[PDB]
Amino acid sequence: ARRRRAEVRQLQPDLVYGDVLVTAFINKIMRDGKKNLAARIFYDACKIIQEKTGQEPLKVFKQAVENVKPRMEVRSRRVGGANYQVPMEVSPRRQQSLALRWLVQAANQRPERRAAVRIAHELMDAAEGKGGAVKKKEDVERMAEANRAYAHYRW
């Protein structure tokens, strides 16, 4: 993509909640394009959260993501001589990207032998500042709370 800066395609809201992020997440669980399967999984996992948790399923989801979303990265560059880390703010379009992606990963990383369970819980673990999911947002925003030498750029 040289110029024109591709335009962010907007998905269609959810059917059980009608709120973007839901599908978006749904999408990340999906494999080989199977919606339904991946769909049940989220909705299943949404159910398991009204029980093991009293909090409504949506709030657990949405409030589990914002705890994930990274606010800083490290886009390497060549200040010449070596390959610097160079950290920057995360465009809000990206945060989401990584966020959900992250969850779905860490999820499958866990032990439980299921789909929802893996999902619901790590969501829940996320709505308390815990979980392998959130773990990564930390190992990340850390390689960026300092950066590393761009003084030749004086300004």
Binding site: A149, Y150, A151, R154
Partner: protein, 123 residues
Amino acid sequence: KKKVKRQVASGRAYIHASYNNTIVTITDPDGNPITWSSGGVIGYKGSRKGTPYAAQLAALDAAKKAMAYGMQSVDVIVRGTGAGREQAIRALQASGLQVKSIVDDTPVPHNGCRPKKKFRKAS
């Protein structure tokens, strides 16, 4: 006395920056020094001593260790041409040290002494 916690309240803050390392210094209003840190003083060993952090970070230790003798306000004194200028400074402007004045005194020979090959042209 023992090691004596001497109060100074005010002094100097000489800063030496160059394409190699950044040395900040603290002194008494009469030149005499109190404590100096650097890039070397804190980990950083190679070209990491000319890393702009080499400014602030040192330019924080100069402070911290320099606030221990009172000093609340200092008169900065920049020197050399390179990177780290102002940073070492701003570093003191957040360190807790009020900054009286900022001065430049970089020494440029009115042409004397043949520089090392490494230096000769410009334009």
